Amino acid sequence: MRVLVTGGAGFIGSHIVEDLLARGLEVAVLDNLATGKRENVPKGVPFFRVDLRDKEGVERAFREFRPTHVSHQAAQASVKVSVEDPVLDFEVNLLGGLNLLEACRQYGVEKLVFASTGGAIYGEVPEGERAEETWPPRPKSPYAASKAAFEHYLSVYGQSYGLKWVSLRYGNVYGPRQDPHGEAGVVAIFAERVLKGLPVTLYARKTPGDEGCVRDYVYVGDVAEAHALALFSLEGIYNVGTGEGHTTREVLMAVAEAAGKAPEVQPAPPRPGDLERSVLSPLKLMAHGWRPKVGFQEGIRLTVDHFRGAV
Amino acid sequence: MRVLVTGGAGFIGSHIVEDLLARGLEVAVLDNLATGKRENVPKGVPFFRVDLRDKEGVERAFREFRPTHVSHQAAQASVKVSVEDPVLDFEVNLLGGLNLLEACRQYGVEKLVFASTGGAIYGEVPEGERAEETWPPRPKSPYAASKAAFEHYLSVYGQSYGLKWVSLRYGNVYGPRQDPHGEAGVVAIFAERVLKGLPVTLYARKTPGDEGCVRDYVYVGDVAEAHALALFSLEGIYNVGTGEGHTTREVLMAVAEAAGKAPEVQPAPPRPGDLERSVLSPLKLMAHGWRPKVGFQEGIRLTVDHFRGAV
Ligand SMILES: NC(=O)c1ccc[n+]([C@@H]2O[C@H](COP(=O)([O-])OP(=O)(O)OC[C@H]3O[C@@H](n4cnc5c(N)ncnc54)[C@H](O)[C@@H]3O)[C@@H](O)[C@H]2O)c1
Ligand SMILES: NC(=O)c1ccc[n+]([C@@H]2O[C@H](COP(=O)([O-])OP(=O)(O)OC[C@H]3O[C@@H](n4cnc5c(N)ncnc54)[C@H](O)[C@@H]3O)[C@@H](O)[C@H]2O)c1
């Protein structure tokens, strides 16, 4: 078993790499360092600094590492950026994604584990409900469209070429090592700024000044666990979430509590591309024994502690 | 109103162009002639020999014609070809489509009418049932994945940038000027071969020697009618089919009757990637008064007549 992790120098990817390493598996990382850092990839790990949009570079990486499994975490991970620059989101997630797929069938890769977005692919999730995998994709932003589109390709690549796959629809992932630049990266932005007495911006879900949007927050540690489970024995679509929603205001207050400092809030109108509410049902995955071993309050404390000592 | 129709030199596109012209509309065509013909575009209609994959080219066409509405019929129309060349299918349908959408946004186009595929997005349609617009996409080939993905982009461009859209899920479109490669290419194949007295290959549905696969055959003239209705007053997803299925054997028998010759049959076992049965529900479009004015038997005669004169 040889696992190639694209975007392995990123937030979630780095946690996947360390997890795989702890399981004694052979791992490699492919990353163009657009948002990730080389420091995130441990010394005893082959690193391929190539862009997925560069066909020649992807082919050389596969040729040198000969992966049996591919964990695809590389992507333009930002709803806002996708709304402002749809072509850039398309090029990396679709175009870059297709290059990866072509390399997989060409090198006979066994399985591909994909990082999809459970938080945005389902569209608005009504009050009191939780999105299930049987729900149809109803993207609102180009980012969600590129992810839904890629799921379709791996589905036809499975049917047409026998490629085994799994699509992990993550909720809002947070935890140590994430950068303060993302829609879900609100936990990192809040933790880093609040600890430093810096004013934070709270985007409304409807009116500047309200509680903000609701999301399903999952600790990155539990996501890495779901990923290992998927890699070894799952096939198909699986939500990776907690099943409980939190408003952005609750996130800030939780972070403020752990940080030990009063927050400075600047209200802002809702930003384009954002859904008002997203909560996922984790039932299908929990049937395989998986469970978020880290609760929200505990997760925030672990993230704040990371930033409090992070340099 | 200025209507630009991509793929206007092809089968369905040419019938759409004539229809819009007969309604006294100002029409333009953009086609790279990959499989289209320059003669299908009538004199007086500005023609832009551009490939959708060429941003500079599409940009130029929009600058000169300044369309208010766009009908997107250009694409890699072969399911079999997408299976053997997914990259080509992706580049033209998604990369090309995306360039088009960006052009629509940049030049403030009002509405985009898309040619989607009913037969391949819904997947296998159970016996006695007819696929409804509310059924989720279950693509099997790269081509179907390409079409389903573009529908997602249309929806997000609608929600994010205000672009009005309509997705027409055509059934098996047949009629004069068609080639033997499209989803209903079997009609052109039988017509040409029966007239020439050449053996006809009849692929089995499940067991060899059966009636063959079931499809919802709609005369191109009727899809042109629906297209005009949608362009002027519809938004959202609409199936464009008769809601009646026909086996390959009856298609051959209808062609034989119209050709007035006993066809030579070359049986063949069922081929993979072929859907057993597809029938669309036309209820949603029918609620707006639309109805096919050309029955199957009549439609096949009109098609066979076209091929008789095809020197
Ligand atoms: N973090 C969340 O809350 C969340 C939730 C659901 C889905 N997602 C999705 O999961 C993945 C992101 O993980 P993260 O939280 O570590 O985010 P991140 O943005 O911190 O990291 C992304 C990583 O991928 C790399 N990358 C980007 N484009 C590349 C390209 N062209 N070629 C090669 N590498 C490239 C970056 O350099 C970086 O290391 C993406 O696929 C994203 O769309 C994120
Ligand atoms: N007719 C059917 O059975 C059927 C059914 C459902 C959907 N479709 C879809 O509907 C549409 C219309 O097809 P048709 O029946 O006229 O078939 P066709 O193959 O005869 O015509 C397609 C036309 O588009 C052009 N084209 C291809 N790539 C291009 C590019 N990159 N840039 C510009 N022009 C390009 C071709 O030159 C041609 O004129 C297609 O988009 C197809 O995917 C076909």
UniProtKB/TrEMBL annotation, chains A, B:
GO molecular function term, any single one: nucleotide binding
Positions annotated to bind NAD(+): F11, I12, D31, A34, T35, G36, D51, L52, Q73, A75, Y143, K147, V173, A184
UniProt xrefs under Gene3D superfamilies: NAD(P)-binding Rossmann-like Domain (3.40.50.720), UDP-galactose 4-epimerase, domain 1 (3.90.25.10)
Record flagged with keyword Nucleotide-binding: yes
SUPFAM superfamilies: NAD(P)-binding Rossmann-fold domains
Superkingdom field: Bacteria
Database matches in InterPro entries: Epimerase_deHydtase, NAD(P)-bd_dom_sf
Entry keyword annotation includes Nucleotide-binding: yes
Keywords carried by this UniProt record: Nucleotide-binding
A Pfam family reported for this protein in Swiss-Prot or TrEMBL: Epimerase
Domain NAD-dependent epimerase/dehydratase: 3-241
Protein family: Belongs to the NAD(P)-dependent epimerase/dehydratase family.
PANTHER family in UniProt: DTDP-D-GLUCOSE 4,6-DEHYDRATASE-RELATED (PTHR43000)
Name listed for the protein in its UniProt record: UDP-glucose 4-epimerase
Natural source organism: Thermus thermophilus (strain ATCC 27634 / DSM 579 / HB8)
Highest classification ranks of the organism: Bacteria, Thermotogati, Deinococcota, Deinococci, Thermales
